[PDB]
């Protein structure tokens, strides 16, 4: 086509979606990880995760307001990944990298799994 | 913070949100423009437009499944802007620039209004 493009548009959209999350505006699901609860937008979860994409395209699960993750999933690992989904920023540290990689493999977030494997290989 | 960042994350999120729109997955509103109907995600509309942000933060309008725009709004101008919201790409042409600018002013999409003013000033 003959379209023009606004370079910062995608980043600005994601920044506004994170503002809506922080104010709990139009969130339509709660993700339960052990005792911890995380509110989010189903569309953002699907856009970032192969696991949520599969869950919310299912004709029965698409209507659930609560999703319980596998009890092996660490709430901190999930929190770091949910923050990444809404910001593009990953808080990867020596003390959390194993829990982050395991959570990203479960959530099917291929690019996060890739950087975790590389950071572990370096050490 | 000490975060790392994935450069293509925001663009990849927006690409997946457009894939959901094209398949009509988790769309939660219909925007009526004269005789024409456009399905979309309220969160994406809010993230892109000052008008939709105001509408869907309203305690009564947040629950509406149908929004009717002002009859002066051109369906083609709206279609081009909805495509821009989900792609960052604007199909700006000599034959549509006046309808696109008028629709962007109504929708409160400041960056689109700015490029339309500049393109009109050049001609």
């Amino acid at each position: 086509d003959s379209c023009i493009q606004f370079t910062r548009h995608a980043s600005d959209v994601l920044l506004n979606l994170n503002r809506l999350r922080s104010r709990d505006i139009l969130t339509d699901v709660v993700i339960v990880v052990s005792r911890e609860q995380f509110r989010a937008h189903k569309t953002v979860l699907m856009a970032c995760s192969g696991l949520f994409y599969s869950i919310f395209t299912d004709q029965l699960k698409c209507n659930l307001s609560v999703i319980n993750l596998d009890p092996e999933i660490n709430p901190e690992g999930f929190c770091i990944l949910l923050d990444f989904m809404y910001t593009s920023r990953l808080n990867l540290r020596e003390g959390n990298i194993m829990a982050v990689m395991a959570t990203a493999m479960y959530l099917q977030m291929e690019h996060v799994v890739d950087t975790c494997r590389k950071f572990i290989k370096a050490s | 913070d000490s975060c790392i960042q994935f450069t293509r994350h925001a663009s990849d999120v927006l690409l997946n949100l457009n894939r959901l729109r094209s398949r009509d997955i988790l769309t939660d509103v219909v925007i009526v423009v004269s005789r024409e109907q456009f399905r979309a995600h309220k969160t994406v509309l809010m993230a892109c437009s000052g008008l939709f942000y105001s509408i869907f933060t309203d305690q009564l309008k947040c629950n509406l499944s149908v929004i009717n725009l002002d009859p002066e709004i051109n369906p083609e101008g709206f279609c081009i802007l909805l495509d821009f919201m989900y792609t960052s790409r604007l199909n700006l042409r000599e034959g549509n620039i006046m309808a696109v600018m008028a629709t962007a002013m109504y929708l409160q999409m400041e960056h689109v209004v700015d490029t339309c003013r500049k393109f009109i000033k050049a001609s």
Partner: peptide
Amino acid sequence: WVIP
């Protein structure tokens, strides 16, 4: 704005 750019030419993509």
